[PDB]
Write a protein that binds this ligand. Structure first.
Ligand code: GDP
Ligand code: BEF
Ligand code: K
Length: 307
């Protein structure tokens, strides 16, 4: 019997913000690691493992938007990063691309994690257009470096947040919406691993779908009542915040959780939604959990890769 060790690693300011907000939100059986050059921001981290990188280079400051300093800082702290990762079966590396630390250090952190054997997933943002062309170009280089270092990558263009706010939505509320991409992906895997399903999925299936597979989608949908299975499946695949949609997916890990009322017909309807939206011929791994504590709720979890 196997129990996978999951770690979430924030790199740079945005990544550590995500870690802090996810710790605040509550999340267990997940080890959080905060990595930064910025000692002022790192001192306020709620993570149990904090690694200040690059102190001999930045004198305790951030990288001043220079990704070469973020990269050199992580390289110089390799053994501390290894020590913190050690034991991980899966590592999520979260970072905002475009600055100095995330852009340069997050690909090194991901490469270390993957070299150490962990299934390594990146979840990174691209800068808002209002931050300018140079920030966007630097971020794009970071994204390319992340792609080369991870098993699977989820990119959230921050400009998508402007599609989900009104003119008054607090910035911090918008940032929480972006955090949900990572939080729900992590929670989805943690739950899939921990619960025994009637058609049981496990971390070996996660590895098959996600190891060395490029772009990825991780989503969860919940619905009740009539058409619940179709609606939950549509929710799981339809986030407005992703660069990579479901269209073209080559591999899918799909789990449906419901109460004793979960019907075979509605499980097919949900699977068909995912198949059809993909518009592809796919390696689908389908699972089912019966949670008798549920009444009318259905939960669909999707991991899609291979575009
Ligand atoms: N969605 C989101 N984006 C962020 C957050 N913090 C920073 N960013 C974005 O991340 C980019 C890099 O900023 P930051 O992580 O502070 O730079 P670093 O510390 O030098 O890596 C910024 O240009 C923003 O686009 C955050 O909390 N949420
Ligand atoms: F704030 Be980052 F380190 F440029
Ligand atoms: K399981």
């Amino acid at each position: 019997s196997h129990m996978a060790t999951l770690k979430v690693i924030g790199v740079g300011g945005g990544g550590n913000n995500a870690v802090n907000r996810m710790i605040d939100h509550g999340m267990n059986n997940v080890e959080f690691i905060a990595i930064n050059t910025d000692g002022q921001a790192l001192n306020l981290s709620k993570a149990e493992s904090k690694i200040q990188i690059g102190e001999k280079l930045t004198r305790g400051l951030g990288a001043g938007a220079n990704p070469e300093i973020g990269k050199k800082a992580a390289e110089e702290s390799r053994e501390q990063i290894e020590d913190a990762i050690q034991g991980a079966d899966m590592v999520f590396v979260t970072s905002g691309m475009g600055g100095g630390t995330g852009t340069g250090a997050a690909p090194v952190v991901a490469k270390i994690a993957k070299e150490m054997g962990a299934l390594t997933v990146g979840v990174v943002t691209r800068p808002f257009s209002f931050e300018g062309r140079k920030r966007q170009t630097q971020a794009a280089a970071g994204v390319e470096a992340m792609k080369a270092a991870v098993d699977t990558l989820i990119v959230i263009p921050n400009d998508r947040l402007l599609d989900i706010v009104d003119k008054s939505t607090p910035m911090m509320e918008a940032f929480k919406e972006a955090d949900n991409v990572l939080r729900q992906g992590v929670q989805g895997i943690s739950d899939l691993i921990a619960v025994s399903g009637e058609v049981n999925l496990d971390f070996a299936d996660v590895k098959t779908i996600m190891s060395n597979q490029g772009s990825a989608l991780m989503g969860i949908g919940v619905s009740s009542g009539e058409n619940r299975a179709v609606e939950a499946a549509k929710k799981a695949i339809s986030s407005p915040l992703l660069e990579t949609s479901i269209v073209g997916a080559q591999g899918v890990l799909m789990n449906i959780t419901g109460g004793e009322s979960l019907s075979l017909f509605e499980a097919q309807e949900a699977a068909d939604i995912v198949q059809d939206a993909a518009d592809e011929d796919v390696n689908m791994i389908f699972g089912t959990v019966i949670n008798p504590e549920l009444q009318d709720e259905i939960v669909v979890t999707v991991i899609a890769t291979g575009f």
